[PDB]
Design a protein around this ligand. Structure first.
Ligand SMILES: O=c1[nH]c(=O)c2nn[nH]c2[nH]1
Ligand SMILES: O=c1[nH]c(=O)c2nn[nH]c2[nH]1
Ligand SMILES: O=c1[nH]c(=O)c2nn[nH]c2[nH]1
Ligand SMILES: O=c1[nH]c(=O)c2nn[nH]c2[nH]1
Ligand SMILES: [K+]
Ligand SMILES: [K+]
Lengths: 304, 304, 303, 303
């Protein structure tokens, strides 16, 4: 292996072109993005056979400084005329390979830095502010792109993936975990009604990479829509396990977005431990945080 | 000093009595709390002269185990019939001093563990779920209560404070920082239009402790309402500094809630560094994260 | 309350004057610091009645920018000719009040950013490198100082405290927790031999603030020495609780350092849950991490 | 992809069999581990075609609960008679596949939870305590293993890697970064003498997986030895970049350990920004923390 690059390249852009013209689904009100404020955290990795002597001999002649990669990304966010993180990565990648002909491969990650709207009173009414936003440390969209230079100096995308990370969902009832193996290693009781708490990271891959860019926005799959599918399916389903839930989420995603080829889940179980099972004159209960060990699941659903 | 206790006592309750009957303000739609899910992280500290030998001699005779304090808190969340974190702390404190007559002082912190609503489709329409909620790692309500046992075995509250913590607000324009001291230590340029990014922790104290409990909910001051005041005032104000902003927020809080005696702010400056000042054919700009050092302000506004 | 300032002012200096000739105690090999690399994270807070209009009116006329306070701290680390964090804070505080006559109060915290030695082969044998150091995320020294301007324009230190933060110690055996209250709320079993795991933050105050500066190193109390007292006392003591342990650590500190007036402890309990009590043909056991709730204690011992 | 498992399975064992008799290298004093306290954080992942319906149908008939995998790991730390994390993973993997015939693949990660010795006064002199240890949040050893069941029902290790994570090293002088591309995107100045601060994660693969287990300790490669090679090489080398440094560390590792097939590096640059270039009557400088963006390098050296 031989790569180098820059991580935590934060870049915040005001007044990116808005995303509109999207295709709606039943599970989501999502209709676009205003883009008054657009934040992204970028990681860039580059490789190429001609970088070998930068390691073996300390020869920096063909080294693009990682600080210069940071400048490149931040300057390109200023000149980007598109509407998605996916399209921003394509713009950076193509531009970088065109600039540096000795680079054979570039890999990019972009993570949304999300902001939410806030309320303000003016002119006699309360409305969402066009100026003041709230930083969110909850779920966020992601994008991944890898591009190569071939022998003829043409460029090709070699992998693209979009995602939603950091979704944390708890369903207070309507979940069971029963019927698992009971042997000399089993101390977990069967539970016909648990408050399942799952962390979800969901990633999708398009059949046609062009649909990821937003240039024809009706073919874009928005992380907001994926989020809303996940919450709807969790609500709708008497869950039998996390494994069962994520399969059903993935099936719904692929049904709503026929332009997707596959969806990949990384899930974790953070369900609370029960303290009080019955409260006089109430349907409530009390729970608390478990010990650190967490279950996890990794699963792909494909159109096939 | 001589105290001991338990921290990170997480407790999650389903179906707490809902908070309703609140008094509204122009800046906020807030109208109550459903309390389908109510999470709190509690810290308890206790003291008393009769605990001295637990330190000086290793005599545990009068030691309530900190693990038992955890049980006490979690069991009392199950039996709590009120509607606020403030009232929950009062219930725990009074109950604990009544149980343990050798304890002279108790201090409690409760921090909300907030959950947000999610969307689900059922019966032909999309609506907010009554079952599936999203864990929020953004701003959260707080409460503080200290109670003492006097010589006659009567109990008194000796300090109460409510709060909002973890609010992170960025205003993209309409903020200046000019006119500060320019001497041999000054390298900061004057800036007539910066994207001010502030972290806010806001705490308030009631004139009458009873109003904090929710028993007559029209006198309660909700953290949600305080949040919405903060965002409105930030939007409304051409800010001249963070100091200027927080004074104005505090004045608005005290005007809207005459039952409050004072409000206290801890603010931090996290404003981004500018990278690109002018973009062809756009009003946008690009910014990035600053170096670690952060400014901060601590300020009290009183009805007087 | 009316204050403002700057936090997370990191400042690293190479080749600070070495601290040498500190009086040793039996529990610790410490006698000084080479200061090839000296790192500190500073927080500065300032107040004064003349700052009122910066809040009430948005008037920045008397505002020293917090960015300028960062420059002030960093430049003063370059000009500091002393040997301790405590003395550096005094130098910053005195200098700032002398510079800015409208400021009536300054509070400073300094937190060591610690670096440990590493091995390098020099002339065929391993020795400590004089160039390569390892950044440590374990325990670190601390210092606090509050200085005011009086009505007669003299400057006065009103509060000083030094400390050791982030010490995490686990003693595998030789600890009990028995005899506590057993009532309706008690589920914890008594334990005559637990692997007590404590986090310790230890703070001390000097009788004479000048001793904190290091100018006469013989009277300086080093956080490294406090660390080694804590480990020695934990080892020597069949503990009966954390409360019992911290009292005994405090007494030993005050006995070793008669120039101190007080020692203050903030401790937390992080003892593991036992999973396997007996292993064939072994004295060992298996444990795991507990649920999140943690006990804590706060206690002052005075000289 | 179709896998599931358990993460953050902490397990602490007292009095694991000591690791002794490891062949030493010049850069390191390491020859063994006392194992009075042995901590590991384990992650387990399992797969098999017979798990399909647990996802597609909600059928838990063939689901080993992830909670039960936690019990399995913790009980096997109690019964483990060997001396290394690598060997513990092999024991868990073999045992799990032998127990659960429907599982075709198991992947394990083990991360050391390191504890350092402390001083106690014993018979009038400081010595290392045999009871009191300090939890370290610095560098730690790692191990990875993937084992499969073949069609003929033999079990086979398909991947093994050991490592050292979290090493943070700063060399105050004797580092340059010059000669890189200067074009429209370049603002970084050349620097002939920077205080290079690197984070290093170093991973190695053995030619013969058995050598990783420690059964013949003479062939075991200890993370402590890798650490000390890295510090020695950093000290000895006038570095020309991180890229140059990690290549040289890798070559030294492979020279010292002919039983290794490869070494893999993940490095990050955290070098401070210079604030004060010259201090009167001193060789020292002042630096501060940079903005967040960090450089990184990934590189394999092969035997
Ligand atoms: O949904 C779950 N899947 C599992 O595999 C599991 N194991 N323990 N609890 C569990 N819950
Ligand atoms: O609002 C601000 N207040 C300050 O005190 C300050 N100092 N630097 N920047 C600043 N911004
Ligand atoms: O040392 C201890 N002190 C306490 O107060 C306590 N409570 N539970 N366990 C404890 N251990
Ligand atoms: O050692 C370094 N390698 C790099 O690639 C680099 N880029 N900026 N600074 C750097 N330092
Ligand atoms: K819709
Ligand atoms: K309203």
């Amino acid at each position: 292996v031989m790569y180098y690059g820059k991580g935590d390249v934060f870049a915040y852009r005001t007044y990116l072109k808005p995303l509109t013209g999207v295709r709606t689904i039943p599970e989501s009100p999502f209709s676009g993005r205003d883009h008054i404020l657009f934040g992204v955290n970028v990681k860039i990795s580059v490789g190429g056979t001609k970088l070998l002597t930068s390691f073996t001999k300390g020869d920096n002649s063909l080294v693009v400084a990682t600080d210069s990669m940071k400048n490149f990304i931040q300057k390109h966010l200023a000149s980007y005329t598109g509407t998605t993180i996916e399209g921003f990565l394509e713009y950076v990648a193509t531009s970088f390979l065109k600039k540096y002909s000795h680079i054979e491969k570039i890999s990019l990650i972009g993570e949304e830095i999300p902001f939410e709207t806030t309320f303000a009173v003016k002119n006699g009414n309360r409305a969402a502010s066009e100026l003041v936003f709230k930083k969110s440390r909850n779920e966020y969209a992601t994008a991944y792109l890898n591009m190569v230079r071939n022998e003829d100096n043409t460029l090709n995308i070699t992998e693209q993936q979009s995602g939603l990370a950091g979704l944390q969902l708890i369903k207070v009832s309507g979940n069971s975990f029963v019927g698992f193996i009971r042997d000399e290693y089993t101390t977990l009781p069967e539970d016909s009604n648990r408050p399942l708490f799952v962390y979800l990271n969901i990633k999708w891959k398009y059949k046609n990479t062009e649909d990821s860019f937003g240039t024809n926005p009706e073919n874009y799959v928005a992380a907001e829509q994926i989020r809303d599918i996940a919450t709807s399916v969790f609500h709708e389903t008497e869950t039998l396990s996390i494994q069962h839930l994520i399969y059903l989420i993935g099936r719904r995603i692929l049904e709503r977005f026929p332009q997707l080829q596959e969806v990949y889940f990384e899930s974790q179980n953070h369900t609370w431990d029960k303290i009080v099972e019955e409260i006089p004159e109430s349907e409530g209960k009390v729970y608390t945080e478990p010990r650190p060990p967490y279950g996890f699941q990794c699963f792909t659903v494909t159109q096939e």
